[PDB]
Amino acid sequence: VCQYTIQSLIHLTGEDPGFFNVEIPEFPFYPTCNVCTADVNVTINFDVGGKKHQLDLDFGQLTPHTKAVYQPRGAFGGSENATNLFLLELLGAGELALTMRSKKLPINVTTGEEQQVSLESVDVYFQDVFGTMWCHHAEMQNPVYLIPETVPYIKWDNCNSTNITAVVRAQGLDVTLPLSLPTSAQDSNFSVKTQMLGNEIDIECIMEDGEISQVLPGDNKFNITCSGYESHVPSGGILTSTSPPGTGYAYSLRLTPRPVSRFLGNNSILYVFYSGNGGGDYCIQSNIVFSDEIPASQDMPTNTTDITYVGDNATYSVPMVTSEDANSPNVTVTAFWAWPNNTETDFKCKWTLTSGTPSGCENISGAFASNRTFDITVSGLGTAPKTLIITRTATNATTTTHKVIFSKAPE
């Protein structure tokens, strides 16, 4: 069914803040291809009291060059306005993410079964621009029971309100705030805690590695954890010592937690609890705002290269993938010219082990060799340089993409 399948393990940490969040890095996103019309189904498997039940979702066409966050086109077996309980957001560097609200019921079940709903695994089906069906599987190594409830908004109104607005972009927050302390020029058993609130969602974060009793002048890095589904890219925070009234001693602090999603709403608020010699005692808050930025890096990271030979008979010994299964059960290689024009025509350059060169897509050719390196052959090169895009993958490989500039011969 699936032409390439990727397994993954989901890592909860702490209480569920109000939504599930999954990151899928392996899917491809070609560079320079603004007509990259990818199509996606999403399937979720729910275990409600021991009964295996499913929830399929449709997301339709993708326009990475123009749109970032996608609401489902439809759903099967959902509750009232079920499609409005999901989101799929691009993140850049060929990465994307999936989010689902968990404080409301996704699917319909009879009275008594509501408390028993739990998630076992998720599948993401991904039709490529070239038609290839990529797939992802995520397994809740330890499921979680869902708890429906309309949790309130909580305001720590007695908190000092600094005006540096927290801009959430690409699910990854990054904000730096100043601090005024009663001296504490050296360790005062500093501890910090953060909380984000809005629209039923509550994200609370804690220090890893204990608490601060080992300050140094200058910069001070420390790890953090947020109650949620931690990203494969870690959360973190860094403190900075001071600058060059009432004995106020200046400090500045930087943070970046990134299991953060838009379900908080444009109205949500962040809360930061820190402490000197006192779970946090000194407070600062800051309003949350979500950027409508389109991720400007969705192009898959490219092995940028330049090539040159005589005439139009140019070639390129295309290497293996990173971490290839040498015996290569099933393999696929595809390429196209930069900034293509027509979806039907410019995207017919595919090869496999069994399938030689098919119809369509002239100017290109190639095959594997006893070298096992794919020696590609091209023709019809113009009087000026042109750029070529190439992608390769084998079973249980990690996808590799090459950017090859066929620079014309010099003077």
Epitope: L9, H11, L12, T13, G49, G50, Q115, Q116, S118, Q141, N142, P143, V144, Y145, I147
Partner: antibody, heavy 120, light 107 residues
Amino acid sequence: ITLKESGPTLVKPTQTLTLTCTFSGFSLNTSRVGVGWIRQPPGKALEWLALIYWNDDKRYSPSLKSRLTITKDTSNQVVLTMTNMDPVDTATYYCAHRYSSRWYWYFDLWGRGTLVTVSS
Amino acid sequence: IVLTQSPGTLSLSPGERATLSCRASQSVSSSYLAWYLQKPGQAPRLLIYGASSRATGIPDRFSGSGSGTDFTLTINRLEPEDFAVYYCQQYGSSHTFGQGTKLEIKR
């Protein structure tokens, strides 16, 4: 918070085994709490047996789901049941408490346990 | 679904440090493991979560570690009070316990 075990400390081979856990300091009709049983055949390792949650879902040891049932009787009682006994089942049996609802999870509190002998 | 601990009945002098390994065949989501303590004639006591998080009443005198296929437990400044049986339990999957380690004072 406390838990107590109760049941027959001797059962005949192939007969049925019934053990009751009585507890105080928490309510299970309210949320987030789960109760389960663990056993230790003297000297051997601990073996998890069964678990039941506030939402009344029940999950058992995979190899012993064929012979087990765990139920709920009063505001403060949980009853385990085990069938088709064999003398190798002879072990000390515990019932324990959990405060989370994260499916598979640690055990926070423990009863002092009660021994079950299995022999004619 | 398996756990395997260090040798049995380790005998140490008080004031030394304990070193208990809890190796595993499949890598649990390393955030999810606990350590337990039982003394014959009593019932098991809870010690640790995620190999580092300490339960109520427990002092700094205890420290676990490790991830995936290997989790480790240590006890500092050994006291005669401490010498009993020890276990490691995995969650994040079907519940399973190690086969146990035991402690003896080298009087």
